[PDB]
Every structure is written in structure tokens, then in C-alpha cells.
Amino acid sequence: QFLIYNEDHKRCVDAVSPSAVQTAACNQDAESQKFRWVSESQIMSVAFKLCLGVPSKTDWVAITLYACDSKSEFQKWECKNDTLLGIKGEDLFFNYGKNIMLYKGSGLWSRWKIYGTTDNLCSRGYEAMYTLLGNANGATCAFPFKFENKWYADCTSAGRSDGWLWCGTTTDYDTDKLFGYCPLKFEGSESLWNKDPLTSVSYQINSKSALTWHQARKSCQQQNAELLSITEIHEQTYLTGLTSSLTSGLWIGLNSLSFNSGWQWSDRSPFRYLNWLPGSPSAEPGKSCVSLNPGKNAKWENLECVQKLGYICKKCPSQWWPYAGHCYKIHRDEKKIQRDALTTCRKEGGDLTSIHTIEELDFIISQLGYEPNDELWIGLNDIKIQMYFEWSDGTPVTFTKWLRGEPSEDCVVMKGKDGYWADRGCEWPLGYICKMKS
């Protein structure tokens, strides 16, 4: 993908033979000059599909093209200082001049930039391409791999007529036959994403894969997406009818990795919908990653994050205080239940307040006269549809700051010093907050 330039001589690096690596005039249309990181420490020649290496970790040896072995300590290179390149461990650098001789010199002949940039070669490092479908259960692409007595350094379409880019998850396909499609924009590609009718969002159900939660997140990110986030009923329902035939575990983007808070969506989505399995969430430590369970009726259960399963991706009048085009008012005299306090606001021209920003919650706790020991009703409720919390005024639920252990009770209140929320019985007399459009 990149050439290997040298400032002091204004030339690149030319791969001549499987045992001859020299320099030449910098040409970007020369296969013999292109290289690419196949691992975090291996540098492969695009021409010969062979990795650069040395015979020994000693001074003044020839740097030619070896066979890419993941365990070979003589192929591991890493960037020290800035543009200095040396074998992993030894202070023996990539000295130059016919063949490129490894040598303990660190002069300008041992400092190398990417042709076209002023950065070291490690600036465009290797990116693990987690495979899709295939028979490899979503393992990372392994370059270079042999197929039909030919080596490939990037995703190919040989052995096919459909143009689907695929790779070999092992160095030798014709022996192991382990492959998987590449997270790239295929000539088709749109078969992998099941588009939502209503919201027109795309989902990708990777059922026949075995990756950890962190790996599953990377595979969604590199595809320009993010792990699943269920914030609707129509979204949860559409996914249940889809994965109905499936029965294995499926990672989703619901985690509790944050040591400070509880459960949260990895894509910053507001926690407004619940669909837990009977017995979940359970009080185990480290079980901080939620997986969908289409076999057990598409419900959520938290397991250890290192488990290897499937995963799904996704692409003002008086007494009324003004803030952001709305007017607010706190009631503390006569404490009322959630339905009685609701009817009061709508006779006054407003509704139970709806918090859509952290700034709006901060305005209530800091300026509105909110005492730290108050317990005030808010319009949040799942009274109508179970487990699906909705606002009173019909405004969208875009911001949710729950309390530790909350939501543990079809009605929610503001309590604690931070002004966080908590669900409780709708039949308890309390104060309440109100909101009306100015």
C-alpha cells in the first residue's frame, strides 16, 4: 500500500528477487516497490508476497524476502525514535548500501519515510479485517494466503464469478480451506445488510461467527457502523421476527464497562427500552456485555465480554421560569400521585416536564430551586406499553440519566443529589415538575 522512501538519497526500496532487496527510482506504479503491513510486526512485499527478514539478529547482514511466519523473530520490525527502523529487540537498524544491509548505523541512510508523506512507516499500521460469513467463524484475514497455486495480498474474487471479495483466514487455503468475506464494499455487498422498512436503518446479523465483545465492536466499526442498540419496540420486534430461525448467542452494544455507571449503550443511545431475560441482569462481576438470545425468544442476557458468539451491527407567564423556549414550575405545597399531579399540569396549560439534554437537567437541579433531598415526579412512564418507557407530553426520549441500580414501577421520579431518575409506584404522593411551551 506504501513505498519505503529515503531522504538522504531521494529513492525508494525495490524488491528485485526473492533474495535481492535494493533501491531504485521512486515509482508508485511499480509492484516491486510496494509493501504492506500484514501484521503488527511483519512487512510484506506486494510483488513477491513475501515478508522482509534477516538471517540473524547480528550486525551487517542481508535483508531479503523470507516466508511470512507469524512466529519468526527475524521478521518482526518496529519503529523506534521517529523514522528509524530496526528488528524487534536489537539496536540493529535498516541501513542502506547494492542490497539493503541491516546495520547498527542510525544515520540518514537508516531513516525512512513513506513516499509522499513525512511520517514513519508505522503511521499506516496493519488493520485486522474481521471476516464475514464463510466457514472461519469470522476470523481475521490472513495475508498473504495461497489459493489455486497463487498468492494474494488483498481481498480477491478468484474461484468465483460473483465478484464477492473474500480472503483466506489462514496462510494456506488449498490445504486448510478456511475463508471469509471481507468487510468491504463488494460489487453486491447489499445482501449482508437487512434494511429496516420504517426507520430505513440497516442491520447486519452475523450469526455464524465467534468473536468477543471487543472484537465484535471492531468489526462493526471498520464497516462504518456500531454494535446494535435497541431504542424502540418496532426495532426490537423487527429483530425478533428476523432472528427467529436462529438460536445462538448474538452480541449487542449494551455494556456496563463504565466503572461509574450501570448499563449503557455503546453507541451513546439513551437507555429507554428493556427486554431482559428472567434472571438477568444477574449480579456477577465481569458479566458486563449483553447478548441477544434469538433461541430464548430474543431477550437480553449479560455474560463475560470475552465469550465468542455472534453479533449484530447497525448503521413566559407568571411563576413560570424560562429555559430554552419553555417555562417550568416546581410544586411542593400539596404532594400528589403521578396521575393527580399530571392532571394538574394540563389544567395549568403545561405537562409533566421532559428532559432532553443534560443542560436541561442541570437547569432544574441548579437554578430551578431543586433541593438535594426532594423526590419529584417526571413524565417518564411505561404505563401504556410494558417495559417501554415513554414521555408524558409525547416528546421523544432522547436523554436518560438513571440512578445506580435504576431502572430497578410504571412511573419515575427525580431523587438523589445528582438529580438522577428512579422508577417507583405511581401511587405515592410527591412534588412534581411542570413544563409548558412559551
SSE blueprint and pairings:
Elements: E1 4-6, E2 14-17, E3 20-22, E4 35-37, E5 43-45, E6 50-53, E7 61-62, E8 64-66, E9 77-80, E10 84-87, E11 101-102, E12 112-114, E13 145-146, E14 151-152, E15 166-168, H1 173-176, E16 179-181, E17 194-195, E18 202-211, H2 213-222, E19 226-227, H3 233-242, E20 250-255, E21 264-265, E22 289-293, E23 299-303, E24 309-314, E25 321-323, E26 326-336, H4 338-347, E27 351-352, H5 358-366, E28 376-381, E29 411-414, E30 421-424, E31 430-437
Parallel strand pairs: 20-24, 28-31
Antiparallel strand pairs: 1-12, 2-3, 4-5, 5-6, 6-8, 7-11, 9-10, 13-14, 15-16, 17-18, 18-24, 19-24, 20-21, 20-22, 22-23, 25-26, 26-31, 27-31, 28-29, 29-30
What does this structure look like?
This protein has 438 residues and is mainly β. The chain has three domains: 4-114, Trefoil (Acidic Fibroblast Growth Factor, subunit A); 194-314, Mannose-Binding Protein A, subunit A (Mannose-Binding Protein A, Chain A); 321-437, Mannose-Binding Protein A, subunit A (Mannose-Binding Protein A, Chain A), CATH 3.10.100. The chain contains five helices and 31 strands. The chain has helices at 173-176, 213-222, 233-242, 338-347, 358-366, and strands spanning 4-6, 14-17, 20-22, 35-37, 43-45, 50-53, 61-62, 64-66, 77-80, 84-87, 101-102, 112-114, 145-146, 151-152, 166-168, 179-181, 194-195, 202-211, 226-227, 250-255, 264-265, 289-293, 299-303, 309-314, 321-323, 326-336, 351-352, 376-381, 411-414, 421-424, 430-437. Strands 17, 18, 19, 20, 21, 22, 23 and 24 form an eight-stranded mixed sheet that branches. Strands 25, 26, 27, 28, 29, 30 and 31 form a seven-stranded mixed sheet that branches. The longest helix is centred in the middle third of the chain and has 10 residues, at 213-222.
